[PDB]
Structures are given as C-alpha cells and as structure tokens.
DNA sequence: CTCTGAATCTCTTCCCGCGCGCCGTAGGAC
DNA sequence: GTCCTATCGATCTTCGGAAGAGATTCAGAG
RNA sequence: UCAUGUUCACAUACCAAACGGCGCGCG
C-alpha cells in the first residue's frame, strides 16, 4: 500500500518544527532548514514508511490487533475514522496512564462501560429518576470518550501505530515495557529511540496525518482481505 | 430461518461460510461486538447467518 | 506434546532402558489380604509412581509442598498419580530372545535377511539344532544348521576353529555377523547373474530389505530382544470385583509367566546348570515371551480356564476388538441418548420432537449456563440441585436453551451421509423421539419400534456445521444420483391420488367456478364431491428468460380436487403438472420440477404442504381395505380347468413314451406360465372392470375406485407382483436348488393354501430371509473395504489442466439402448470441443459443464459419442481436480474444492449393497465393426472376422441397436441396406464354429493319412459318412505333428491372388473337426470345409473390485500380426504370435479344452480374443489401457445394479478405479534413482519425471498396475492408515523394519490422532495454513 | 436413555456403555464416515475428542459451556496415547515426530 | 540338475448398533 | 484351613468354512 | 517586649459403577 513522493510533498510531510525544538537524535532524518524550520528527508522517509507498512500488513494478515494512538484534537477524528474503517481499535482521547500495563484495571473499566452502554440502549429500563439517568449518562459519555475504541479489543494489541512519539510518549513507554512493536510517526522534535519502526514525518499537519492514516488503513485492510 | 443457501450465494465456497459464520459469531460471543442486523435474541449461530443476509460480511472483516 | 508426523522403528536395548523408570524383578502384583502393591512387582509404586492422588505410599508426605521429593522409608516419588499411567519399566532377560513378530510375519524378516528358511531358524530358536558360525579351518558353512549328532561329530572332527551355537544367541550372532552393505552390493550384482524370474523377484525383496535396514538407523540385532519393556500398570489394571477378588487381568498373567521363567533362568545360570537343563529353561522362556507378544502364533495358545486363550498385547492392538477399530477410529461419546422413534405428522420438515426428560438430561451444561446468567442460581452447586428438584422455572429456561440448538439424529447402521442428519428439536411430553414422516425413508427408519440415537453438538463450530450442512432442509437430494430423497411417503401419495381422480358421476358435477377458494368452499360445505369434474378460472405464473414472473390467467377444465390442490403449489410452476390423476412417479417428478424451477427454499416448504395435504385427504378418503374388495376373475376357474388337460396331454405322450423326460417337464412349466399370465391379465382386467356407472342415462365405465386397486395404481404400496399373489395366482414355486416345481400354487392368499402349497411356499420365503441375514455381513465388509481404500481422495484443485478424458455413449446392447446418453453425460465437463453433428461447427466449448440445458441441447442433436473428463484421467498429484469430477450430485453445481469425494463414493456404492442378493427390433441400417468379409458364389456376404460386431442406425441419424455376430455368419442384409424391424438380418450355425474358403478350387487331404490323422467313419445314421479328424489327445506326434490340412489347389501350383498377396489358399483342420470335403472336391468361395461343435449377485461386484481373476480367464492375444502354433499338445499345447515386424518368437502355453478362436493364419492384435470366457482386468490394463479398464469396470459393475433396478452415478465407480490403479511398475529406471526395477506410487514417479524432463535427463517408464482394493489399501504409502485396516501385524512390522515415517496427509490418519481432517471445512483451514507459507 | 456426563472407563477414558450404567452412545465407525462425507470437520473433531477422550479438553469444555463461551480446546485423545504405549510395549519404537 | 509350471500348507477376513441374562485360578502342603 | 506355586516334563485341543492369497514344495525337461 | 521544660524507658519482624466369554432378542 505504498505512498508516492509527489503525494507526500503535496501533503506537506517534509515540513518540520523550528530548528531550536529539534532532537539531535532526529538529526539523521533531516534534510535541511529552510527559513529557520527543519525539513525532513523524504528520500529516507519513504523506504522506512514502506518497511513499517509491510510489517503492519503482515501482522494484519495474520490477524494482528493494531491499536491507533492519536490524541491531538486535530488528528483525533481522523485516527478514529481510520481505525473503524479498517475495523481496528483506537484511542483518540487522552491515553490513560497504564492502559496496557495496568490492563486488569482498565479491563474492569471497559466492563463498566459495556454494562452502562447496554443498559442505556438495550436495557429500556425507564426508571431513571432523571438524576440516575444523568449520572449514568455522564459516566457512559466519559467512558465512551476515553475507551470507546478499545472497548471491543478484548485483550492487548499486537502492534501500536502512534501519531507523534513525543506527544504520546507514555503510550510508547508502556508498549516498550510490554514488548509490543511500535510504529511511530516521528517529527523532528520527537525522540525516536523508543520507537521500533520510526517513520519520519510531520505529525502536526492535518493533511499529512490523514495521508499516514489512510495508507496504514489500506495496508491493514489488505492484510484482512488476504 | 434456517436454509443458508442465500448466504452461500454470497460466500461462493460453502466452506468459507462456516469459517466466516464462526469467526463473526465469535466476534459477537467472545470479542464482545454486536450485530449490524437487528437481533431477535437469536443464537449467534443464527445472527451471523442473518448478518450474511444484510450483505455486509466477508473474511476481510 | 505437539507433533506433525509419526515415526516408527526398532528399539535398541539402550532406548528401551531409557523408557524405563525401573526394572521389574518379582513375579507379583498386589498382596492377597491387604491390597498394597508388592514392591518391585508389576505395580510397585516406586517403579511407576504413587497410587494416591497426590500423596505418597509410605505415608511420610501428603501435601503439594513436597511435590517431587523421593522418600527413604520405601522410596516412592510423590507426584501426580496421573503419571502412574505414563511411565514404563523393563525386564532384563537372562538371555537374548527372538521377537515373535519378526520371526513369523509374512515371510520372516529374520530369515529373509539371513537367507535362511523360517523352519530352520525356528529349529534353532526352539533348540532343536545348532547353527554354525565363524566356521574357520573346518568343513562347515556360514549358517547351515547341524543336528546335535552332527555337532558332536564336529566337536571331534574339528576342535574349535569354528563355532556353532543354539537358541536366540546364535541368531543374534548371525545377525551381528552381517557385513550388511557389502552383502547388498554383492547381491544387487548377483541379481544380474541369471535372468531367473523365480528368484530375481524374491531377491528383489531381499535387496530391498537390506537397503531398508541400511537407510534407516536400524540394526539387525534389534530383532532380538534383550530388555523387554512392560506396560505401564494403569493400562492393565488389576481391578477388584464382587468381593475380595481381583479380576483376572490377562497380561499380568503373562508377565508373571515371563518373570518366573527369568527368575529361574538367572538362578540356573549362576548356579551353573548343565546344557540340557538350561536348554530346558531357555526353551520355556522363549516359549513364554512368545505368549506375551502374540499368544497363539505358537503351536497352541496358552489358557487359564476352559481353554480360553489369554489376550496378549498384539491381540490388544489388532482388529475388531482392538484399539484401532474399537477405541480409536470410533468411540463412545457423552451428551447423547437414544429412544424408540415414532411418527410426528405435524412437524415441519426441519424439526424433530424429543422428550423433555432427555432434553433436560442432555442439555444440563447449557442449563447451568442460563441459571448462573439469570443469577437465579449461585453456581453449579445450586443449579444442580435446582435442576434435580425440576422446579417450575427450569422448563422456561430449557425452552430458551434449546430454542434453536440443532441436535443430530442417526440410526444405525448408517450407510450413507443422509444417515446422520440434524434437526431443530421441539419439546415433547412423552418418551419417544418424534421424527418427521418424509425423512424416515432416508434413514430406512421404519416405525415398527426402530430405535434411534441423538447427539448434541457442543461448540459454536459444531452448530454452524450442523445448520449449514446437515440440516434436513439442505439435503433434499441423494448424494448418489440426481434423484430426490424426499420421495413421498405412501399415504401421502394415496391421498393425492384420491384427491385428483375424476369420477364421471358426482355431486355438483359440471359447474364453473372463479377460483380454488370457492372450490374449497364448495367442497367443504359438501356441495361438490372432490373428484367431480368442473371448469375453473385459474391463474398460473412463469418466470421469464430473465427470471422474472409473468402471471397468466384462463379458464381451465379440471376437477374440484385438482383445483384445491393447485392452491398448494408455489407461484411459478405450470398447472399442467397438477392436471392429472397423481401417483408416486408423477408426484416425484412434480417435486423434482419444483426444485428445477424454483429452487430449494420453496421446495422444502412445498414438500411439507404436500405431506400435510395428502394426509388430510387420505383421512377423508377412508381408504380402508376389506376382504370383499379382493377380486377373483371367475375365468380363473376355467383357465386352470383348461390348462390342466393340456398338461395331461404332455403327460399322456409321456405315458406313451412319445416325449422325452426333459421335454415333458420344461414344456409343462410353460403351460403353467401360459395359464399364469392369463390369470394375472384377467385379474387386472377385472379390477379395472369392477367400476361402471350411469351417465344420467346408460351405463359407462371409469377407473376403478376399488380399494386395493387405488393402492396399486397410485404406486402407494404393493404393485403388480403383490396384487397378483393376493387375488390372481401365486404361480410357480422353486425348489432349494432353484429348479422349478412341476405343479404350481394355483391358489392365492384371498383363498386358502392347503398344507402342501403352504409348505412349498416356505422354500421361497426362508431362502429370502436366509439371504438377508447372510448378506448383511458381506455388504458391510464391502463398504468397509471401499471407504478404507477411497479415503485418501479429496478434491484439491480447480482444474488440473488436462485435455484428456473418456467417451460416453448410450449403452447399446442386446439390441436396444438400456440407458440414454442423458444418464451418463449429464453434468460432467467436456474433455474436448464438441462439434455439431457433421463437421467444423463447434457446439460446446472444450471445458464446459454440460448442465441440464446443455444436455437437452445435445438431445436436440444427433450426437452419439461425447468426450468428458473423468477422475481416472485427472493429472492432479495427490488428489483430483474439481472440473474433472464435475457436478456435485447433492448440489447440482460443480463440486466445491475440498470435498471428500472418496468417502462419498464408497458409501454410494455400499448403500444399495443390501438390495442385491448373495446367492433386429426396429427399422434401421447395417453398420459393422471389424467385419472383414467375402461374397460367396450366390453373391451373399459371409463374415470372415471373429471380433465381429453389428451396429444399426436409425434414419434420423443415430445408432440404436447392437449385436455380436460370429465368424462365418452370413449378413442377409449387407452393403449398407436399410431393413425393417424384425426383418432377419443374419444367419449362423448355432452349434459349431465353421471354416470357409476365400478362393474356389479343388481340394486334397494334404499331408494326411487315415488312422494317422482322420478316422474312416460310417456315421450310423446313414452309413455314408463325414470323417472325424483326430484330436491331438487321441493321436500321437504321428498325427499331431502331421497337422491336418486342406489347401485349395490347381495345376498352376498357386491360387489366383488377391492383389499384393503372396499367400496361397492353404487351410487347416483343428481337433474334433467334422470333414465331408475329401480329396478332389471342387470348392466354392463360401463353402464350409468343416465344422467344429462346442455370474451372480453381489459377489460378482465384490470380486470385480478386488480384481480377482476368474476361474475361466479368456486368453487374450498380445502384440500383433499373426498367430502360429508353437508345439503340439502334450502336457499342454503351446501357441505363438508373430508380428509384421520385430520379435517373431513369442510363444505361450495354452490350455487344450478352451476351444480356440484362431488356428494358424489369423491376423491378430494385442487384445484380440483367442478363447471365449470372461476377461481379466490385469490383462485388459496391459492390452487396451487404463481407459479401457475403466470402461470395462464401469460397465460390468453397473450391469449388476441396472439389473436389480438400483441407480448409481457412474463417477462413483471411477473414483474407486482411480484408487485401484494408483501403483506403477518400473520398466526403465532411465536416469531416475528408483531401483532398476521397482514398484512405486504413480504420483511419486510422475512428479520425479516432470522435473527430470525439465532437466532433460531420461525419465523413467513404467506400467500402471491394477491392485484390488483389499490389497491397494495395504499398499498405501502411510502405515497408520493401512495398519488400522487389516493385517495389522503385517503392516506394523513391515513398516517397522523399514523405519518408515508418516506425514499424516489424508483423512483416516487425522481422525485417529483426533485433529481436523483435511477435508471440507478442515480442508479450507489446512489450505489457508498452507497458503500463508 | 440419555447422558450428559458421568462415568468413564479406566484403561481408556472413553465413556461407559449401557443403561445399566449411565452410558454414552457409540459414535461408531460408520458414523465417522458419515461425518466425513459431509464437509463436517469440526463436528467430528469434537465428537471424537472433546466430547469423548481428551481428559483435559472435556473439563475445559464443560466449564466453557457453563460459562456459555461456546469454544473448545481439542488436544489429543488419551486412547491414542494408550495405543502408543501398547506399541511401545512391544519392542517397536513408535514415537511422535515434530516437523 | 535345478528352471518355470504347478501343489499343499498356513494365515487372514467375515455389518452396525443395542438391550438384557449369567459366570468369573486350583491343587497341594504345611 | 490357609498360603503359595504351577500348568498332559506317563493327554489329545474337534471334524460341520470358504476363500483367497501367499510361502513354501515338487514336475518334465534343456 | 514573649525566658525555661530533670533521668531512663516504644511494641509488634513467615474423591460416584468395568472387562471377557456364552447366549436371546431388536432391528
Ligand atoms: Mg423396523
Ligand atoms: Mg535553667
Ligand atoms: Mg527536654
Ligand atoms: Mg536507667
Ligand atoms: Zn513417602
Ligand atoms: Zn483434472
């Protein structure tokens, strides 16, 4: 499910952060600095992206549970859409500390969410007092927002595709602790050391984020088709 | 409903219909998903066969 | 442990010690007051493991904290008592000992490897003689058993510059002496040292064996035991029974024998007994271990009761009470139950009722899974009690558990897939299983108290398989033939017949109605009779060329009941299917056409409605039976009183000697036949005659409402052959040896039989019952042999890519066509592009499925022969391609990749196996086959060929009759003439073989003398004679070598030639011959110079597939060209074939008493028939090929089923043939690494060839060779599946010296180890596993 | 007669047979060919292991059914391990193999 | 003088289920 | 009466299976 | 704007029926 260079350039992936906010661990994955702003080397980007995509495709083909971590409010909608498009699991709002490492507790949380949702829709209980309904609804909304994507995930994921490692660093650490492969998009400010499949690129721009999501979605879907 | 031939019109190998009906019924019973067809409290056995009738299942899903 | 193959080999002594956890020493088991196991006996807890659940025997430790400590009070290990069944021990034998299996298999593996006769190694091993080894500077050989006299000789004729030993040590030494590879390298050269077939082959065996011992890791001494492993004790438990007594647990008596003997032998060895004493105990020990391994291959089986032989280990493995058949291949299962079935008429076809008591005792795990889910019970501990109390809630729970969980019902035996089916249960108050009426026919479930078992499927996958595949709604067709199995139940068809008749007088007859609904109001109010004639408006529907309905409407002229019945038909069929008095055939096609036009989902409901309807009108019909309704034609009295005197005419001639003792009988029984046909015909006329009624004025006749005649004429039950006996006459009867009774049963069961007629009647019936009870074994052993050869097949490619195949025609024989092309060819795929009759116009593309609209199209054409792919020709390795198999009969579309076709075929042959028994016509024109012929001086065409056949073609352009015509018959119509039906086409001598001349001229008895070659007969009838030519059995070489001859002669010295012929008209006389044409007779073209005067039911298929050669194998010619005699008959005759070119000197020993179809001068081919009698497939394969043997076997087996009315699609026989000829025999090894001649699986050589051909090196060539299934299974390439069939101790040792390895491809092996079969759903998984690769 | 669960034989753990004992019906040899003749593989796998012989799997199955999980773990039947030892109790080294 | 024919011996196979019923180491020595 | 040790190492295992096939035993001779 | 506070004393701690003939019977 490869992506073209012209398309990447058009999207605006090559653009990075200011030169002062850069990580010298990202100094290999940098081409130049135009107008005091780093430019990511797309020549090195595309093969890395392709390699990551291939690994993801293989995992999907063997029925791997990909988890799409994206919390930036600009990219939250897009990541959620991509995940559901390729029938996968996602976390579009704040990553709860120890979502994976403290799985037995977040498991209890998911059970609670499922029960509340079931009561809301299938229950048809009617006896709500208005107060009880309001409290139940608030709980349901909060749970859905936080854990709505992983509610059907059942267990832990077999791979973690992550938008911006510096922003979603806690997730990266959790994955590392467990030993789940990470496929992170890594801008010039981010540190790539925890990431297993670094894909240099612009985490900030929305079009770029969409492009990354869409390509990943295509590859997972392809794996599912097999 | 019981005769699965209209689902076999959709999964043109009949063996794949058992592998797909099982996989989908497991996403419901075990994976915790719920059906895109209106359920009538049928068994997942029948729900998954009724999910082929909506024309929205193949082993990509 | 996970695994993916199985390997077998001989166990070296150090391996056997490795399996041990201890060495057994004492001949004991458990104490006889207390019941602790006696230490170092066969149960010692420290050898094998602790008895108590997780706690030790000495009592010192009783808690998991100590898990794995070993005590020092008695020495036991504290561990899982489960492992007490896992761990072995061993016995150290005081001497080596031969393993009985390798001593007495098919050959002996010991003896064969040694080149030493079995009796002679046994003569060592039971201590009867010495055997000599390392013979050195003495006059003695390398093995050469020598009697104790002959050793006592050598002990002083020689010193000890040699050795000889006795008993198993001596054999062990001999095996150890094997310089094994060097012996092989020699023997594989000594192979060439003669061309002597009578050892080249048993030497091929020996040179195979040596290389198998080389290529495995094996070593020959391991045939001899030294440590004997003992079975883990839990597998041979010494259970107590009724009071303080142990069950006699056989093996523990056998090991007890061994260990006692070994205790003695260690004693007497160390106390240094003399040779005669130790040869005693050593014999008794070898003769005891013989018991422990395979008791009763000894001279006599040993016993511990009233001569009951003790069951030894090898008696536990093999056969009908041993693991492979008794516990592995099929086994008892939980969640099951059984009951008497009873009919439930109200069921929809998918349901069956089963008793609430059973559902509640079967579904218990699911019921607990609701009571916890209601939270109504705390857990198992409460829900168990809440079910036991049978509280008022539990049924509303049960009726939620079951609410759509399919349950599997099968009778036993269960011949074919339709014999297990799934149904949705509905609850019942009683205790019987309420089955659906239409489905009882499939099971051959009668309702006379015939029990049936039920099984619950537990998992989700088992429910999805049950609903998708096995549910009764999905199985309306037979697997075996395109014919429904929902075929209506006799009462249903009785009701529909009664509903649809027309009665010419009736209430309300002749009015005109606006539709079925007011037809029904008219019936139900009693205003019109149901079979009254009427006109109605009707509407009917048709689905157009696109498939969309056109609805139409008209007046129809019909009956009230055909109007009512039309209301049940689904809206897409034409009314012309209902507008007729319906009966069992007519309604089966009705139902079939519903399936043809609508499809399944309407058909099952339409079938249900038919059932309900037929029952309801059959009720109203009151269709009773009553003795006043048995109708005797009073002409019967005259017909006997006439025929009796004509029999007495045959008797009065006999009373005057004026007719022979044979003729009197065989004519009398034909007079009784002429009476019997007349009685039957008068009775069927009387039954139709009994109904006549006033058409408002004057009487008129109509089809008889006579009770028994409705039942016959409808096809409900009891057609002509029964009603004939009820009221016509019972007729001729047969004696025990089948020969016919001289005076028949002229009575019938409406009237009485007297005592003799009854007593003779039982010779029929008791024969027919003996046949049933005797046959039901052989039929089952047939189906077993078949599935257990077919089970290796699975459809595994879409299209193998062949363009090869075989040709289908109507079977034209005995005159008319016994089956049309539309039976054979429907639903195979074309092999090659099928042309328009004529030329160059193609009609069907070259790999198109000939479904029904294509086969109707072929029937629109004058096609006679069609070439189609057949599984015997499909070049898929390890399987079959789908297109080559063609239509799946139970679905009508092409087969699904992965379907288990082999098992379907074997069952499809076996299902009717109980129905067997174990005891010119029309105008056309002459066509001919092989018939080289000449014209006589009258100008008549006289046949000069001997594989001669006749074909007749009808003028609209298709062949429709065929005949086989002798040599020297005259074609009364020749030269392409057209002829009328029954216009005699040919004439021939019925009694003798004729011999005739091509030339005309004078003749002599050339090279002949009276008394030397011919006998000067008088012929007593005339005194003027035809001479007898002498038989080679009546006269010497001075008559034999003087072979009598009749050359046609002229003073030119040669005859007027045929252009391009050198041959004179020399002709010859065989034995027995009659000759009227002596010397100096002028012979015409066409003159006869001389004349020469001259099966079963089921076994004739069982012995067909096993390919047994018949008693009377027709001698078939070979290669080509022309015959000659070899040397004449003494001991036997020898005769020759000599080609047009190449190897002239082919000669064959030939039997004298099978008269020969050729003499000396006859042009011949590989496959021309030199005698009569039946053929033998081994040779057909050699001479006309694989396609010709398929065509032979399919014909000669279907000629059994067609005779007994059974139907089977032909493909299910080819699938057995496909397996019969899976093996091949190497003629050229070429460049391949097979032995210089070898037998191999054909796929293995073919796959080597294809790549070697791509390498361009010389591929191997072979003949395929046809094994019968009882052998072609044991030759499977994979020991588990063969060994679990039969001859277990063969297969399981032959495979063991080879060290063979099994990859577990195929079905039966995966069933044994209990994993998904690689078929069906499990094929699709094995395929995905193999694709992601 | 009907049986959910109850006795098992000692030598090999298959169910007892009878009414006089609370037995399970024999899914005998011919029935197995009948399943093989449908595509039905999972039914067969169950019928001759989980429902029958696999000493682990049947207790895991039972609990999955009371839990209503409708899933099986199929293992390998203990009667077949009986066979291996009864051959290996001859000097015939039969063994399971890996690749 | 033993080589391909044939001749006598043993081994191996014989439906599937099912239900009852009973019956179940001995002899000798201390 | 109980415990321990052994079998027809001084007879007689059933004729009423057929078959069907193989291993193993013998003809008429080059 | 607000100085001082005698001495010594702190506990818990490694369990639910088994295997073979002989029969009769059902299908
Ligand atoms: Mg019956
Ligand atoms: Mg002070
Ligand atoms: Mg102080
Ligand atoms: Mg102090
Ligand atoms: Zn202990
Ligand atoms: Zn093919």
Swiss-Prot record, chain B:
One function term, GO molecular function aspect: DNA binding
The reaction(s) this protein catalyses: RNA(n) + a ribonucleoside 5'-triphosphate = RNA(n+1) + diphosphate
EC number: 2.7.7.6
Membrane-spanning parts: none
GO cellular component, one term: transcription elongation factor complex
Enzyme class: transferase
One of the GO biological process terms: regulation of DNA-templated transcription elongation
Keywords recorded for this protein, A-Z: DNA-directed RNA polymerase, Nucleotidyltransferase, Transcription, Transferase
Protein family (similarity comment): Belongs to the RNA polymerase subunit omega family.
Task of the protein: Promotes RNA polymerase (RNAP) assembly. Latches the N- and C-terminal regions of the beta' subunit thereby facilitating its interaction with the beta and alpha subunits. Part of the processive rRNA transcription and antitermination complex (rrnTAC). The complex forms an RNA-chaperone ring around the RNA exit tunnel of RNAP. It supports rapid transcription and antitermination of rRNA operons, cotranscriptional rRNA folding, and annealing of distal rRNA regions to allow correct ribosome biogenesis.
Subunit structure: The RNAP catalytic core consists of 2 alpha, 1 beta, 1 beta' and 1 omega subunit. When a sigma factor is associated with the core the holoenzyme is formed, which can initiate transcription. The rRNA transcription and antitermination complex (rrnTAC) consists of RNAP, NusA, NusB, NusE (rpsJ), NusG, SubB, ribosomal protein S4, DNA and precursor rRNA; S4 is more flexible than other subunits.
Protein name (database record): DNA-directed RNA polymerase subunit omega
Protein's organism: Escherichia coli (strain K12)
Biological classification of the source: Bacteria, Pseudomonadati, Pseudomonadota, Gammaproteobacteria, Enterobacterales
From Swiss-Prot, chain C:
Cofactor(s) required, per the database record: Mg(2+); Zn(2+)
Binding-site residues for Mg(2+), renumbered to this chain: 446, 448, 450
GO cellular component: DNA-directed RNA polymerase complex
Record's keyword annotation contains Magnesium: yes
Binding site for Zn(2+) 2: 800, 874, 881, 884
Co-factor: note: Binds 1 Mg(2+) ion per subunit. Binds 2 Zn(2+) ions per subunit.
Pfam families per record: RNA_pol_Rpb1_1, RNA_pol_Rpb1_2, RNA_pol_Rpb1_3, RNA_pol_Rpb1_4, RNA_pol_Rpb1_5
A GO molecular function held by the record: magnesium ion binding
Assembly and oligomerization: The RNAP catalytic core consists of 2 alpha, 1 beta, 1 beta' and 1 omega subunit. When a sigma factor is associated with the core the holoenzyme is formed, which can initiate transcription.
Similarity field: Belongs to the RNA polymerase beta' chain family.
Protein name: DNA-directed RNA polymerase subunit beta'
Encoding gene, per UniProt annotation: rpoC
Swiss-Prot record, chain D:
Portion of the full sequence shown: 1244 to 1342 of 1342
Assembly, per entry: The RNAP catalytic core consists of 2 alpha, 1 beta, 1 beta' and 1 omega subunit. When a sigma factor is associated with the core the holoenzyme is formed, which can initiate transcription.
Family: Belongs to the RNA polymerase beta chain family.
General function of this protein: DNA-dependent RNA polymerase catalyzes the transcription of DNA into RNA using the four ribonucleoside triphosphates as substrates.
Protein name: DNA-directed RNA polymerase subunit beta
